[PDB]
Write a protein that binds this ligand. Structure first.
Ligand SMILES: CCN(CC)C(=O)N[C@H]1C=C2c3cccc4[nH]cc(c34)C[C@H]2N(C)C1
Lengths: 338, 214, 54, 230, 258
């Protein structure tokens, strides 16, 4: 039985590959061939926020499309007012090694985490006119990579011990644990209906999870290196990923396979972050060569370049109303484009 | 601007002063990275360290400078995903235990990756050889042939220790990096002086290469 | 190893029995959403400077 | 949160006194502070204001050159020095805290005052002076001499309630927003120069005097006050 | 003789553009806003000012035989611009040497705010001193000469070139000893001595021939042919060409931006 089970595993893998082949009749490039291109897209820098003294690792927009938070290796969290470039809050962090941050949809909480292996929750709206720590979540055996809010009482985290978890803030415990990855989980993304989420790890694969039952639905493998970023389509039936092999790919859920590949011969550097537009016609990616490219999501053609940084672009972001794009970098600066 | 808009602008100015003060108070520190296999003497490298499973930070003060030491051994994951967080440190401290023939060929393997890393092209290394006394008493039983098979020489105390030092220094292939080596026992107390002198030579060399001499 | 291998086989079976649709149908669905919301995307059609808050 | 004021008493005309206030339960250094007085036969009147960091000081036109305001952060104390006291200065003096950033709620906490006895502005008009009125709906009105709608899209109108034998408390800020710890039956609406406050499903403990204040520019002005009686 | 007019014009044009490019790089590029870079900017400004107006009027004087044939109240703006704009270059070289000296002998104490403070003190006293040495023979006291008074040829010459020369020689001797003592080996040692030889050699032969005559003639009793004098004068001017080469051409962070 120590070898009979292995034979059945290879048999089921071949059935899946043949089933996907039968569902492929035409490519997306063939279908969308008779569409006028979007053209040339040029964007200018409208704001430049200063005040950080080290590398910037993460940022997140608010649901009101005016407020945003950012994290840096100087041990500070800063909340900005993008319209007037005013600083609202500056929260000192106990551990200076930070890798991710999040902003609650309601607007009353923020999240932080890093090499300490604790996710920390901060209370913004309270008496005494100051920000105080509300909860410390412990239980991961590796560094925290990403975190996202579902409500004011639920949060999902990914870590470097090849697991994902869902927590209850008041109790301080984790209700569900998601397992199956082989390498370190690096990125995470939530669906608009918040009933499923997708993850990508260092085993060059992506998995679809069910929040309630805590099971695994589908697995996607098309890359050749580590996966760093992931994002959902606004419709909710597709997602995109970025890897270290200088390539972005688009995956479909109902067809359960890959649809498009975005690549060029002049790029040999990795991809740090990806994001979509409000309509879904544009895909934005940040690279290691200090730039940011704009792709046509339906025709796999370059449209524009955003070049204003002196070091590596670490993070991206698009407002809920699709009016601006924010970028962060290792030169302690973050800019707002339009 | 309205009455409340002017009040908000004044709040941002005070936050900008606190941020400026904290940056000044942080630039006058020396950051060092502590690496090595388990049971190599990392925890007791300096007698007067004070702690201030993730990352462990120990700080001590000497002369007038402030030293910060970071220990990362509790992260059993891929180093390449977080090794870039320590790109701007002054130097790297490496510890090797000479009484253990099992950790060998693993300490050498770990030393090779650090010395040939993309983010550490021009970072010097301060190398510590620990437990020389117990290594000397052990050599009367195992003549270093068990650990290193390709060894031919008079192995009393020195040619054995000289061989180990030559093995680590051969891993460096670069003209802008220097390796500092020192042998310590379990009772030596002048470890802070050795670190102080090595850092002083590092800053001098960095200043010459900024004026076109090296 | 017996326990580890049994779980792997029990996972492949669940993923190998689902309902899949054609690529052509799914490609058309991706198109239709784009022209439906094309006129409400400021990054495609920039708004006049009067309505731009940046 | 607690604010306690000390001082007061009987002072001869032409004299001088000093008033103090003590804070406990919040961060005193991140708040601006105000002084507001209430004559025995009048309503509320603004006096002075000192900013966080002591960078800005404002005075009313009728206390300029006579009164002084200062703060002490290590000891958590606010001061007020008065000289050349006339008979019109007899009132009860309150101490109010306020914070200023995007989305905040200034004028949110008031203290219990101390009594003192001595032997181009915008005009806010509240036409109603008394209304006899349970289980019903009432509406109050306030008027302004100039439009309070700024070019940034904010209307700077504030409401307050003063129960008998108590200190005033905040109900509505910026003409629409509802303060914390206030039942949802209070609502606010209006436009430039015309404002209204609506109370639905009236209950007990809602009796008292209601005031409208503007925060567009200094000095800050109040209304006459409308009284609700059973 | 015809090509001589073009050759001097080539030196005049190249110097003005070369130092202007240096100023643009420091102001524009954000990686050159550090403490060790404000001093090199101040040297470029002095070399620009020499090439802009000091050199072209010198050619006209040389072109117009030996006589002036121009109006007064203009050479007064010409004599005062040859002493202020040339002394600044000499004293900016000294400021570079002193900064480098203290970065090698006191590495843990000459850094951060102390380095920024002392560097800005030097950049001020280098300009005030040249103003004093230029306007003193005007505010206090045909062919437009500077001064033949012996009371002035032993105060400006010593106070502008001879005193800085002693400081520069002493500093670079200590740096050479420090580099050799602190330790492949043959290649590094050869480069260390070659770099210092370029620095001292250019600074001496470009100024020492003219400045010796400026001291002997007002004290002794002897004149020199105008042929020899003309060659000497243009040696000094030709130091706003090497300066922006040596102190920026052979450094990496600069050549990176070409
Ligand atoms: C334009 C004036 N003329 C034409 C008559 C010159 O012959 N001028 C010479 C005199 C000089 C001088 C003399 C004494 C002290 C000094 N400190 C710095 C200098 C200087 C510069 C030096 N200049 C470069 C050459």
């Amino acid at each position: 039985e120590l070898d009979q089970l292995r034979q059945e595993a290879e048999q089921l893998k071949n059935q899946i590959r043949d089933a996907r082949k039968a569902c492929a009749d035409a490519t997306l490039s063939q279908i969308t061939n008779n569409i006028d291109p979007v053209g040339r897209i040029q964007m200018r820098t409208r704001r430049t926020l200063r005040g950080h003294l080290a590398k910037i690792y993460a940022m997140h927009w608010g649901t009101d499309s005016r407020l945003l938070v950012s994290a840096s290796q100087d041990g500070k969290l800063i909340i900005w007012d993008s319209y007037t470039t005013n600083k609202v809050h500056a929260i000192p962090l106990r551990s200076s090694w930070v890798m991710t941050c999040a902003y609650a949809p309601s607007g009353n909480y923020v999240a932080c985490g890093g090499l300490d292996n604790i996710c920390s929750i901060y209370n913004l709206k309270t008496r005494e006119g100051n920000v105080r720590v509300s909860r410390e979540l412990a239980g991961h055996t590796g560094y925290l990579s990403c975190c996202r809010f579902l409500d004011d009482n639920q949060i999902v985290t990914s870590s470097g011990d090849t697991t994902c978890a869902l927590w209850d803030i008041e109790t301080g415990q984790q209700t569900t644990t998601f397992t199956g990855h082989t390498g370190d989980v690096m990125s995470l993304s939530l669906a608009p209906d918040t009933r499923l989420f997708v993850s990508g790890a260092c085993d060059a694969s992506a998995k679809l999870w069910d929040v309630r039952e805590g099971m695994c639905r589908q697995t996607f493998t098309g890359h050749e290196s580590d996966i760093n970023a992931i994002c959902f389509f606004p419709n909710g039936n597709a997602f995109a990923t970025g890897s270290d092999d200088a390539t972005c790919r688009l995956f479909d859920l109902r067809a359960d396979q890959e649809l498009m590949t975005y690549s060029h011969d002049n790029i040999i550097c990795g991809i740090t972050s990806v994001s979509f537009s409000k309509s879904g016609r544009l895909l934005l990616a940040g690279y290691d060569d200090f730039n940011c490219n704009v792709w046509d999501a339906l025709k796999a053609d370059r449209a524009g370049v955003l070049a204003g940084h002196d070091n590596r672009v670490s993070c991206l972001g698009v407002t809920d109303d699709g009016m601006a794009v924010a970028t962060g970098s290792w030169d302690s600066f973050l800019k707002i484009w339009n | 601007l309205s009455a409340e808009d002017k009040a908000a602008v004044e709040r941002s100015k005070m936050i900008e002063k606190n941020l400026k003060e904290d940056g000044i108070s942080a630039a006058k520190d020396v950051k060092l990275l502590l690496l090595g296999a388990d049971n190599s003497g990392k925890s007791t490298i300096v007698k007067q360290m004070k702690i201030i499973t993730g990352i462990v930070e120990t700080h001590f003060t000497f002369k007038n400078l402030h030293f910060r030491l970071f220990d990362v051994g509790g992260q059993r994951s891929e180093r390449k995903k977080w090794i870039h967080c320590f790109e701007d440190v002054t130097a790297i401290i490496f510890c090797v235990d000479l009484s253990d023939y099992n950790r060998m060929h693993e300490s050498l393997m770990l030393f090779d990756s650090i010395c040939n890393n993309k983010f550490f092209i021009d970072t010097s290394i301060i190398l510590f050889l620990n437990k020389k006394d117990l290594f000397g008493e052990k050599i009367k039983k195992s003549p270093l042939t068990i650990c290193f098979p390709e060894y031919t020489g008079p192995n009393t105390y020195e040619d054995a220790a000289a061989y180990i030092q030559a093995q680590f220094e051969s891993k460096n292939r670069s003209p802008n990096k220097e390796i500092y080596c020192h042998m310590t026992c379990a009772t030596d107390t002048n470890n802070a002086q050795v670190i102080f002198d090595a850092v002083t030579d590092i800053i001098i060399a960095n200043n010459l290469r900024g004026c076109g001499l090296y | 190893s017996i326990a580890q291998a049994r779980k792997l086989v029990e996972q492949l079976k669940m993923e190998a029995n689902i309902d899949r649709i054609k690529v052509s149908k799914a490609a058309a669905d991706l198109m239709a959403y784009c022209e439906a919301h094309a006129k409400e995307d400021p990054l495609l059609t920039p708004v006049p400077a009067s309505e731009n808050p940046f | 949160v607690q604010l306690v004021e000390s001082g007061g008493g009987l002072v001869q005309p032409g004299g001088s006194r000093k008033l103090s206030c003590s804070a406990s339960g919040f961060a005193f250094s991140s708040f601006g502070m105000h002084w507001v007085r209430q004559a025995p036969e009048k309503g509320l009147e603004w006096v002075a204001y000192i900013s966080s960091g002591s960078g800005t000081i404002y005075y009313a036109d009728t206390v300029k050159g006579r009164f002084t305001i200062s703060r002490d952060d290590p000891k958590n104390t606010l001061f007020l020095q008065m000289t050349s006291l006339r008979s019109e200065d007899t009132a009860m003096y309150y101490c109010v805290r306020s914070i200023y950033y995007y989305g905040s709620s200034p004028f949110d906490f008031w203290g219990q005052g101390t009594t003192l006895t001595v032997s181009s502005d915008i005009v806010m008009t509240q036409a109603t002076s008394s209304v006899p009125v349970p289980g019903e709906s009432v509406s109050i009105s306030c008027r302004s001499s100039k439009s309070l709608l700024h070019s940034n899209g904010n209307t700077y109108l504030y409401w307050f309630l003063q129960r008998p034998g108590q200190s005033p408390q905040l109900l509505i800020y910026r003409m629409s927003n509802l303060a914390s710890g206030v039942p949802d039956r209070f609502s606010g609406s209006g436009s430039g120069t015309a404002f209204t406050l609506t109370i639905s499903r009236l209950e007990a403990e809602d009796v008292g005097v209601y005031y409208c204040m503007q925060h567009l520019e200094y000095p800050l002005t109040f209304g006459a006050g409308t009284k609700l009686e059973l | 003789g015809v090509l001589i007019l073009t050759l001097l014009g080539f030196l005049v044009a190249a110097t003005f553009a070369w130092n202007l490019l240096v100023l643009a790089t420091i102001l524009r590029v954000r990686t050159f806003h550090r403490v060790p870079h404000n001093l090199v900017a101040s040297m470029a400004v002095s070399d620009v000012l020499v090439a802009a107006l000091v050199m072209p009027l010198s050619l006209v004087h040389e072109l117009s035989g030996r006589r002036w044939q121009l109006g007064r109240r203009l050479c007064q703006l010409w004599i005062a611009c040859d002493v202020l704009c040339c002394t600044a270059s000499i004293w900016n070289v000294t400021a570079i040497a002193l900064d480098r000296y203290w970065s090698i002998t006191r590495p843990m104490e000459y850094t951060l705010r102390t380095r920024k403070c002392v560097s800005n003190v030097m950049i001020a006293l280098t300009w005030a001193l040249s103003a004093v040495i230029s306007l003193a023979p005007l505010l206090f006291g045909e062919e437009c000469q500077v001064s033949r008074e012996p009371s002035y040829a032993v105060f400006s010459t010593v106070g502008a070139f001879y005193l800085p020369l002693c400081v520069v020689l002493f500093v670079y001797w200590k740096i050479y000893k420090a580099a050799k003592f602190r330790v492949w080996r043959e290649q590094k040692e050869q480069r260390a001595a070659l770099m210092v030889g370029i620095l001292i050699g250019v600074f001496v032969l470009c100024w020492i021939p003219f400045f010796l005559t400026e001291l002997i003639s007002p004290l002794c009793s002897c004149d020199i042919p105008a042929i020899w004098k003309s060659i000497f004068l243009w040696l000094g001017y030709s130091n706003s060409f090497f300066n922006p080469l040596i102190y920026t051409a052979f450094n990496k962070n600069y050549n990176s931006a070409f």
